[PDB]
Amino acid sequence: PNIQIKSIAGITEPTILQYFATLNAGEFAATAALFAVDGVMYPPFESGIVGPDAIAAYLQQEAQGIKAEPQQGLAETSEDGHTQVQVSGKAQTSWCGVNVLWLFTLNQEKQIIHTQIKLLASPQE
Amino acid sequence: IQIKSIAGITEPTILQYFATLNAGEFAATAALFAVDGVMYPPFESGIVGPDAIAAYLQQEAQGIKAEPQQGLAETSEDGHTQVQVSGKAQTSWCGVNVLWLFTLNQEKQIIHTQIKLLASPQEL
Amino acid sequence: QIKSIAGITEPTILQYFATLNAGEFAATAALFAVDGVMYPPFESGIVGPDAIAAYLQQEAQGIKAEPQQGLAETSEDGHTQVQVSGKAQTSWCGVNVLWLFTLNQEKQIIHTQIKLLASPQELL
Amino acid sequence: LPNIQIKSIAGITEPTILQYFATLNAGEFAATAALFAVDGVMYPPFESGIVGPDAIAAYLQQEAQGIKAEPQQGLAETSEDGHTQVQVSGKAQTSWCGVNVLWLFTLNQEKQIIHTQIKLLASPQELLA
Amino acid sequence: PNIQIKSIAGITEPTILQYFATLNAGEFAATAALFAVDGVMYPPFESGIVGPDAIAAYLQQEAQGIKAEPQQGLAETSEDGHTQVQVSGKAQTSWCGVNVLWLFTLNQEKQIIHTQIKLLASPQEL
Amino acid sequence: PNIQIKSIAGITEPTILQYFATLNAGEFAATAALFAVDGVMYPPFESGIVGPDAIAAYLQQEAQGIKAEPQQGLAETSEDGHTQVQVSGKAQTSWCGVNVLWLFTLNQEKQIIHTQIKLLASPQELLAL
Amino acid sequence: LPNIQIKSIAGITEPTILQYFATLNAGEFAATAALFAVDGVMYPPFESGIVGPDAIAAYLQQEAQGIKAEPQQGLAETSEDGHTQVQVSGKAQTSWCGVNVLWLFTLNQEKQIIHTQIKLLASP
Amino acid sequence: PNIQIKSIAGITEPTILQYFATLNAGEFAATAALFAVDGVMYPPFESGIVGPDAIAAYLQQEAQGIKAEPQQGLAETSEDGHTQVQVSGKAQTSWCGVNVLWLFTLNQEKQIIHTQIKLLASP
Amino acid sequence: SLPNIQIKSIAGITEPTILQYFATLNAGEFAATAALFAVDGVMYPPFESGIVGPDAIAAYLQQEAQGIKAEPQQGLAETSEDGHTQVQVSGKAQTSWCGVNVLWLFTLNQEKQIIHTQIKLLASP
Amino acid sequence: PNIQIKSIAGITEPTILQYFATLNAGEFAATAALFAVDGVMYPPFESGIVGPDAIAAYLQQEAQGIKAEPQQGLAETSEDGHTQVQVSGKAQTSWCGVNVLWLFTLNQEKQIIHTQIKLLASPQ
Amino acid sequence: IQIKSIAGITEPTILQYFATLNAGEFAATAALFAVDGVMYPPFESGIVGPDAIAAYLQQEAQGIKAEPQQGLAETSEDGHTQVQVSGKAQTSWCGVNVLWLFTLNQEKQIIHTQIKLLASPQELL
Amino acid sequence: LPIQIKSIAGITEPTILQYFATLNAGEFAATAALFAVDGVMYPPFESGIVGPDAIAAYLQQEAQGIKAEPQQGLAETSEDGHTQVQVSGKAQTSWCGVNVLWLFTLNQEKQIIHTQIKLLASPQ
């Protein structure tokens, strides 16, 4: 299946664009494949999910019907060769919509070692 | 906007090179290359770095649709990735069959890419 | 200096080819009537000199037309029909082309069209 | 990549003439020069007659930069010999100064500019004294 | 003489496997045999060599002591029943080794109609 | 043409034409190349030989004096896309000539998956009196 | 490269001024610009101030092409602070049209143009 | 009078272009004017010549026949606000041309403090 | 066929044994090449061990030097106190797939026989 | 300390003469200065030593009391503007002496990008 | 770190001349000369060939600091290069203003170099 | 400045191949240089010619336009260290050929001490 994604201001990291594109297409396999073997997805509020297999199972049930809408981002390369990425935008679900900051850390080979979402909103929690 | 899948190719950089080339994101395409990454177009000499590359693409690559059908990718001893991709290039005047070659570094940046036309006795 | 074309003396046509090869796309578009149409081979149909000049600025970079010969006819309405056959070489591919044109009474290009011929035609 | 805006000149449909203005406007001084016959002459308003396309492209390369011609309307005649006379009137602007202009052209049987001349037309000068 | 037949990732087309196998074992009459009667082998530098007989002579003198090491390749079937094959790898001669793209076009009967070698740039800075 | 791939009545599958031509020319690398990675040559009296490398090795030692003279063959296409081929003929070595049925099985890509030999009644078993 | 015509201007003997006109007329826009201080300002007519030689030279390259300055006369005075105030009057010709002009120049102790300004003499 | 000088690669310093242009057109008064009050001209071989009056004098009688043809030069500004200039080229006379290095040192105000010629030949 | 022998000029080199070394090499004629050596003359090819005597050398050149074209461009020659001649020649060795730049080293005895020759390639780390 | 600067037949490239003159004089800092910033001296048997600082370091401890005696050499200029130099002769250090081929490559600025040493003959 | 640039001078031989003299590398300086190259110092007669030149430099040029400020260069018809560099030379006993002249052959060896003293603080009373 | 000879069967002695290759090229100066200082060339019928200078001079006037075509030869080494060579073939001109036997005696340094030619034929 062919997938589409809106390009994200300040980001040309291909792993990051693919992460968003796959997610909005339902290809949770391709999304989880972007993680390294021991890569960790922390979603909002729930505990960390490890490895492509568990990650892709998590997405299959929970991440259906969410549309990620990243507007902008920044990427910096640390001393150890890892890449740190911040991306801001909106999530839209079938109930309501929120503002979101997505955090990624990629290895020397651009596999997602970990990613963490935080909502942009103050003690309504 | 517009990431077509390519049989046998799942490498995000490769899919996006063709995706961005199909839009007018010659800067987005260009950014996929390493700082000293080379783009040898067919018949011209090697164009070094994302800046030159995005310049080249802005004047010459307008109105071209790459239509990659299939590809294979292999990992060398040095960690580098070798990719071949085949398919069509449609221009306003004619459609040709094309082999795209790519070598990626350990960081998935295109170190070099080369195009070879598929066709026999065609002069200059 | 404006090369001749066997069988063709009609200035608008000589000027059409000469201006394209030298990349003078404003000159090329100026030959068209206000509502003149350039139908390139695979795409829509481009109206007016402003549009036409734009299109020629992006796609027709690197092109060389090589008309060999032509014919021309004058219709009952005062218009002039011109057929010019030859080769068009771009950085990808060279093709055998037949340019069709229709000038009005003032010798402005009302519309032009490009048609392909053959070359890879073995068959049994 | 220059934006190309092609005027459209009232009463003038002779393509060589529409090219002439189109070319000058966008800086294709080579194209402009191509429009002349081999021994064709361009008389700009103040200097002497410049001969042949090679010279004319030189002259236009250094002098005509930045210039915007704005031909408004025109007339044309076809002579007994097959030549075409053309008169086009309008404004020529520079970033320093704008005047009103009559461009004269003559074309040979082959629609090449044999000669073109510029004539300046009175602008707000008060002979009203 | 020890014969080492390597797989070629993505390539299972027997004529193509044979071409590489024969070259490496120095069976250049077998290599030539894979071509159509009017088949053309274009080496990288010299002009086109026509027919099995010429091809076999050429390989007898020039191709001695070469090792082709194809890595991977792709293929495509045209409408005319022909097969296009693109194979990429290294060719080593012990004086020098270069990276190469082999192109092949096979007719309906799997005979090589024409094959070309194209060199790929190696360390060539500025 | 000096270099020759002889036809075999009934047989147009090129893998098979090449199998016989290469055997007869001694080009055992070319022959072994026809087989898939895990292809098996079962010679008539010995156990199966697996993979091109082994098959070339075998043919280098045991098939040096050999002349296959295939006469005719047939082929069929199974449900799975494999091709079955039967080719009957004579095989002459320096020690003895026999009547032979060669069997082949080709994958979808026309590589030899397996081949077998089956001896046929010869001129002298036919002297059954 | 260019030959430099250091035209006399009645009333003006300051070389920076003579050279400002001379370099302009020879097409030497980088020479002209060099006459300014590092933070010197050229106020052309109608557009805003342009600061520094590089910027000035750049501006001159695109806009000043084709123009002959024809200064006729000028006057200079030295201020208490050691600066020099110069007015020069005359024409600026183009191939299409001539305007009368007043060039103003203030120079520093080191004969650099710290600023210049042009005023056209007319009233549109 | 209109004064002529073929441009000098790497030099835009006006006092320097004036010097050569005045020299060539014979205006030795104007040349001398470029010097500070105690400015020195060292011509080839002979001693210093101090101030405009002496310089003009000197130029009137010796320099009449010479076309200086400077081709290139360089200028840099020392810490003392002075400018140092090297200009190289040919000096033609009606009998013979030689290659020349001209040296100039300018004060803050761009007057020539001192200038020195040197021939490039080895007879 | 007796090969036609092409005695290409080599700028700076006039010693026939050296001009003929290349010329024979190019013609096949490896036996003629080998004859240029003294009885105990040594050919050190690149990477491999030294090879002694015309017999051994013609054997070696028969199997390895097939389809190589030496392309010597210039050279220099000096005569030592002992009457021997020291020659260096630089140039290209072309095969049908690739070329390298080459320095040939030669030492000739008083009788212009090659007592030893050594080749070195000019590239790589 | 007496310095002796021998001519090298066939070789007039100054960097190369300096390399040898310097080495034989104990001026390793100078020798090292001949190399580009990222230039490499490969000595025989050991691995490559990058940069002048390192190269001077190396030469200070290991290279004392070596006398290079180059005899003759050839040079070439490549398409890229680099120079390749091959120099042959003897290295002597009293206790034992060997025949040597020095190899050099210079950039467009005549700095040494890499130099290697190859030992030659006498063993058999 | 080594090899200072000189305004307007890109000729490596000249850069190397100054750098080497400043550090006491008279061997490196002398080596820039052609075999028959001449160093005319300002008061003495000309010194021929690298061996002599290094000798001269060993006993007269120790303690010198040359401070070239700028220079120019021209290529003559015969392919020779002509270089003029001006600046200061300070020794322990006194400083001077100097014009260094150089002539290079086609191969950028120094054929000859000459020193001209420029007028210093000499008041003309 | 390349010269060539067809391979001579049984001969690899380089002085001998050069003699023929120089001769056929017209390079009679080089042919003469193969002889020792007191080397003698006895041509057919005429008296012996001594030394390269005389030899080259002779060859300049008499050897013009003759192509030697040696087919086979033998070489032996005597007890004195000299080399005795016999070569047989044709000597052609554009009119008519004759069969020839060349004899050569070389010194230890492979210089031609003497050569003699004989016609093979019983006419005249």
Distance from CA of A1 to the nearest CA of B (A): 7
Task: Return the partners of chain I (3 or more C-beta pairs < 8 Å).
Answer: E, J, L
Q: Do K119 and H50 touch (CB under 8 A)?
A: no
CA distances from B2 to A2, A30, A31, B24 (A): 8, 16, 17, 12
- Please choose, from the candidates A3, A31, A27, the residue with its C-alpha nearest in 3D space to the C-alpha of residue A102: A31
How many Å apart are CA D89 and CA A18, to the nearest integer? 60
Q: Do L21 and I31 touch (CB under 8 A)?
A: no
Which amino acid is located at C80 in the chain? T
Give the chain E residue nearest B115 (alpha carbons). Answer: E120
I1-125 CATH, one of 3.40.50.970, 1.10.3210.10, 3.10.450.50, 3.30.2000.10? 3.10.450.50
- Please tell me the number of Cα atoms within 13 Å of I113 on its side-chain side: 13
Distance from CA of D58 to the nearest CA of G (A): 12
Q: E strand or H helix at A40, and its extent? A: strand A35-42
Structural fold of domain E1-126 = Nuclear Transport Factor 2; Chain: A, (3.10.450)
Query: Which positions in chain B touch E77 (Cβ < 8 Å)?
Result: none
Q: Do K124 and H86 touch (CB under 8 A)?
A: no
- Please choose, from the candidates J123, J90, J82, J88, the residue with its C-alpha nearest in 3D space to the C-alpha of residue J106: J82
At D76 the three-state DSSP class reads strand
- Please choose, from the candidates I108, I53, I52, the residue with its C-alpha nearest in 3D space to the C-alpha of residue I82: I108
Give the chain D residue nearest G47 (alpha carbons). Answer: D95
Burial class (CB in 10 A: 0-12, 13-18, 19+), K4: exposed
Beta partners for residue K3, in sequence order: none
Q: Do D19 and C31 touch (CB under 8 A)?
A: yes
How many Å apart are CA C113 and CA C81, to the nearest integer? 11
The answer to whether the CB of F30 falls within 8 A of the CB of E27 is yes
Q: Is L18 near chain I, with CB under 8 Å?
A: yes
Structural fold of domain H1-123 = Nuclear Transport Factor 2; Chain: A, (3.10.450)
Interface test with D, best of G60, G61, G95 (most D CBs within 10 A): G95
E61 backbone dihedrals φ, ψ, rounded to 5°: -90, -55
The answer to whether the CB of C35 falls within 8 A of the CB of C50 is no
User: In angstroms, what is the resolution?
Assistant: 2.9
How many Å apart are CA I107 and CA I120, to the nearest integer? 15
- Please choose, from the candidates J118, J9, L31, L111, the residue with its C-alpha nearest in 3D space to the C-alpha of residue I87: J9
- Please choose, from the candidates I69, I119, I30, I74, the residue with its C-alpha nearest in 3D space to the C-alpha of residue E45: I69
Residues 34-93 of C with CB under 8 A from D: 34, 48-50, 53-54, 57-58
Interface test with F, best of E3, E53, E108 (most F CBs within 10 A): E3
A48 CA to centre of own chain = 13
Beta partners for residue G107, in sequence order: G84, G113
How many Å apart are CA B71 and CA B14, to the nearest integer? 10
Of B59, B62, B96, Cβ closest to residue C92: B96
SS3 content of chain B, % helix, strand, coil (to 5): 25, 45, 35
How many Å apart are CA J102 and CA J119, to the nearest integer? 9
- Please tell me the number of Cα atoms within 13 Å of L76 on its side-chain side: 6
Of B41, B63, B122, Cβ closest to residue C59: B63
Please tell me what DSSP assigns to residue H64.
G
How many Å apart are CA H50 and CA H113, to the nearest integer? 10
* DSSP string covering G61-119: HHSSTTPEEEEEEEEEEE-TTS-EEEEEEEEEE-SS-EEEEEEEEEE-TTS-EEEEEEE
Of E86, E118, E121, Cβ closest to residue B86: E86
Distance from CA of B79 to the nearest CA of A (A): 9
Q: Do B62 and C60 touch (CB under 8 A)?
A: no
The answer to whether the CB of I119 falls within 8 A of the CB of I96 is no
Sign of the alpha-carbon torsion through J10, J16, J21, J23: negative
CA distances from F69 to B6, F19, F45 (A): 47, 12, 20
The answer to whether the CB of F1 falls within 8 A of the CB of F75 is no
If one counts every other C-beta atom within 10 angstroms of the C-beta of residue D3, the result is 9
CA distances from K123 to D80, H39, H49 (A): 87, 11, 11
The answer to whether the CB of H30 falls within 8 A of the CB of H11 is no
How many Å apart are CA K98 and CA L47, to the nearest integer? 73
How many Å apart are CA E37 and CA E52, to the nearest integer? 6
Task: Return the partners of chain H (3 or more C-beta pairs < 8 Å).
Answer: G, K
Interface test with E, best of F12, F27, F50 (most E CBs within 10 A): F27
Of H4, H15, H109, Cβ closest to residue G6: H4
Distance from CA of I109 to the nearest CA of E (A): 28
* DSSP string covering F24-45: HHT-HHHHHTTEEEEEEEE-SS
State the alpha helices, DSSP H only, in L1-124: 14-25, 28-33, 51-62
Q: Do E117 and I95 touch (CB under 8 A)?
A: no
Of I63, I97, I123, Cβ closest to residue E93: I97
Tokens coding A116: 């963490």
**Which segments of chain E are extended strands (E)?**
35-42, 49-50, 67-77, 83-92, 97-106, 112-119
Beta partners for residue I103, in sequence order: I90, I120
Place of tokens 């021939």: H119
Q: Is K115 near chain H, with CB under 8 Å?
A: no
For K41, residues 6+ apart whose C-beta sits below 8 A from its C-beta are K47, K56, K60, K115
Torsion of CA F14, E112, B114, B5, to 10 degrees: -30
Buried b (16+ CB within 10 A) or exposed e, I77-99: beeeeeeebbbbbbbebbbbbbb
**CA angle F108-F112-F113, nearest 5°?**
80
Give Rg (Cα) of chain H: 14
Burial class (CB in 10 A: 0-12, 13-18, 19+), H123: exposed
Beta partners for residue B6, in sequence order: B9
How many Å apart are CA F105 and CA F85, to the nearest integer? 6
Q: Is C118 near chain B, with CB under 8 Å?
A: no
Query: Which positions in chain G touch H9 (Cβ < 8 Å)?
Result: 1
Place of tokens 């190269």: J55
How many Å apart are CA J98 and CA J115, to the nearest integer? 18
Task: Return the partners of chain J (3 or more C-beta pairs < 8 Å).
Answer: I, K
The answer to whether the CB of H102 falls within 8 A of the CB of H57 is no
- Please choose, from the candidates A83, K22, D22, F1, the residue with its C-alpha nearest in 3D space to the C-alpha of residue C31: D22
How many Å apart are CA F75 and CA F13, to the nearest integer? 9
Burial class (CB in 10 A: 0-12, 13-18, 19+), D40: buried
Which amino acid is located at E35 in the chain? F
Beta partners for residue D73, in sequence order: D10, D89
The answer to whether the CB of C97 falls within 8 A of the CB of B99 is no
Sign of the alpha-carbon torsion through D56, D58, D62, D67: positive
Q: Do I4 and L9 touch (CB under 8 A)?
A: no
- Domain map (residue ranges) of chain B: 1-124
Task: Return the partners of chain L (3 or more C-beta pairs < 8 Å).
Answer: I
At L71 the three-state DSSP class reads strand
Burial class (CB in 10 A: 0-12, 13-18, 19+), F4: exposed
Give the chain D residue nearest C13 (alpha carbons). Answer: D15
K29 CA to centre of own chain = 9
- Please choose, from the candidates L99, L96, L106, the residue with its C-alpha nearest in 3D space to the C-alpha of residue L36: L106
Query: Which positions in chain E touch B99 (Cβ < 8 Å)?
Result: 74, 86, 101
The answer to whether the CB of H75 falls within 8 A of the CB of H11 is yes
The yes or no reply on domain F1-129 and CATH 3.40.50.1970 is: no
C1-124 CATH, one of 3.30.70.2740, 3.30.429.10, 3.10.450.50, 3.40.50.620? 3.10.450.50
How many Å apart are CA B99 and CA B89, to the nearest integer? 10
- Interface contacts B/C by beta carbons within 8 Å: 51
Which amino acid is located at I68 in the chain? I
Parallel, antiparallel or unpaired: strands B65-75 and B81-90: antiparallel
How many Å apart are CA D20 and CA D113, to the nearest integer? 9
Distance from CA of E94 to the nearest CA of B (A): 20
Give the chain D residue nearest G61 (alpha carbons). Answer: D65
The answer to whether the CB of H30 falls within 8 A of the CB of H22 is yes
Place of tokens 């310095």: J3
- Interface contacts E/F by beta carbons within 8 Å: 92
C9 backbone dihedrals φ, ψ, rounded to 5°: -115, -5
Please tell me what DSSP assigns to residue C6.
B
At I54 the three-state DSSP class reads helix
At H123 the three-state DSSP class reads coil
Place of tokens 């005509």: D64
A61 backbone dihedrals φ, ψ, rounded to 5°: -90, -45
Interface test with J, best of I73, I92, I120, I124 (most J CBs within 10 A): I120
Beta partners for residue J35, in sequence order: J112
Give the chain G residue nearest H30 (alpha carbons). Answer: G13
- Please choose, from the candidates G58, F75, E44, the residue with its C-alpha nearest in 3D space to the C-alpha of residue I97: E44
Which amino acid is located at G109 in the chain? Q
Q: Do F33 and E14 touch (CB under 8 A)?
A: yes
- Interface contacts A/B by beta carbons within 8 Å: 47
How many Å apart are CA G104 and CA G75, to the nearest integer? 10
Q: Do C30 and D6 touch (CB under 8 A)?
A: yes
- Please choose, from the candidates B56, B36, B34, the residue with its C-alpha nearest in 3D space to the C-alpha of residue B115: B56
For A83, residues 6+ apart whose C-beta sits below 8 A from its C-beta are A13, A75, A76, A77, A104, A105, A106, A110
Give the chain C residue nearest B63 (alpha carbons). Answer: C59
Give the chain B residue nearest C58 (alpha carbons). Answer: B62
CA distances from K57 to K11, K64, K69 (A): 22, 10, 22
Interface test with D, best of G46, G61, G97 (most D CBs within 10 A): G97
Give the chain B residue nearest E41 (alpha carbons). Answer: B120
Q: Is K13 near chain J, with CB under 8 Å?
A: yes
Q: Do D4 and C22 touch (CB under 8 A)?
A: no
The answer to whether the CB of H16 falls within 8 A of the CB of H8 is yes
